[PDB]
Design a protein around this ligand. Structure first.
Ligand SMILES: C[C@H]1N=C(N2CCN(C(=O)[C@@H](CC3CCCCC3)NC3CCCCC3)[C@H](C(=O)NCc3cccs3)C2)O[C@H]1c1ccccc1
Length: 241
């Protein structure tokens, strides 16, 4: 498939190489964030990851990772040429929590080299959250292997209820998970994906959300809040030329 091809977090299971070929790991200093390769030179992440404005030259993007800590011969390490946070991102409400990383092209104009293990994810036009974050709130360490968990969408009516997130859910956000708790994104999953298999398009992986924020991890009535990628389609297309 041109995009969304697939080869093979609290309450998740290990996601081996090729399960999320689009997932990107972003490193700088002692900080980390996840992202999604949406085109060979473009990675979509959360704006809150880059609030402190690290210099692009200090960033490293790694594609093809299974364990974050291992050196991996087929994995692709790329420099970041520049990045763009959404101009409306608010560090107080977390509205408009999205950012684009423009990967550094080589002498031949190439960034990510596509393979069975590295493939872009489709943009919108069943659902899982993935990441290397804490496997429970307060965990001393990030997960060693990439984790994946199946989480369903929650309507704006149910997520904006007073016992759930109330008035905190603003336009551009969506919720996914369970009101029962137990399965969700957690600290360290920032910027990562919420991908769905598009039944209408041969089950191709489609990026529906960006892991943004949560009140706890897997708590009852507190599902994870994601940036609604479909809400920003024109912004993404406008800034990825
Ligand atoms: C270091 C990393 N910590 C964070 N953040 C600390 C706050 N946060 C939350 O959701 C806040 C709420 C927000 C609401 C809006 C206003 C600000 C508080 N609550 C969490 C609950 C779980 C424990 C941590 C706090 C963000 C987050 O974890 N997002 C991922 C998640 C998705 C679902 C559940 S946690 C960002 O991001 C990373 C990072 C930052 C900077 C550079 C690189 C990485």
């Amino acid at each position: 498939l041109s995009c969304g091809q697939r080869l093979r977090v609290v309450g998740g299971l290990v996601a081996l190489r090729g399960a999320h070929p689009y997932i990107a790991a972003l490193y700088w200093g002692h900080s980390f964030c996840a992202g999604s390769l949406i085109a060979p030179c473009w990675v979509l992440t959360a704006a809150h990851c880059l609030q402190d404005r690290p210099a692009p030259e200090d960033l490293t993007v790694v594609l093809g990772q299974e364990r974050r800590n291992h050196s991996c011969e087929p994995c692709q390490t790329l420099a970041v040429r520049s990045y763009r946070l959404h101009e409306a991102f608010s560090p107080v409400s977390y509205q408009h929590d999205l950012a684009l990383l423009r990967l550094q092209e080589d002498a031949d104009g190439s960034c990510a080299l596509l393979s069975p293990y590295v493939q872009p994810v489709c943009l919108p036009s069943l659902c899982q959250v993935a990441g290397w974050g804490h496997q429970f709130e307060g965990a001393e360490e990030y997960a060693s292997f990439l984790q994946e968990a199946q989480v369903p969408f929650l309507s704006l009516e149910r997520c904006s209820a007073p016992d759930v997130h109330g008035s905190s859910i603003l336009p551009g956000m969506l919720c996914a998970g369970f009101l029962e708790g137990g399965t969700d994104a957690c600290q360290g999953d920032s910027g990562g994906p919420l991908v769905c298999e598009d039944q209408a398009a041969e089950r191709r992986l489609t990026l529906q959300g960006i892991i943004s924020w949560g009140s706890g991890c897997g708590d009852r009535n507190k599902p994870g809040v994601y940036t609604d990628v479909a809400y920003y389609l024109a912004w993404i297309r406008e800034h990825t030329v």
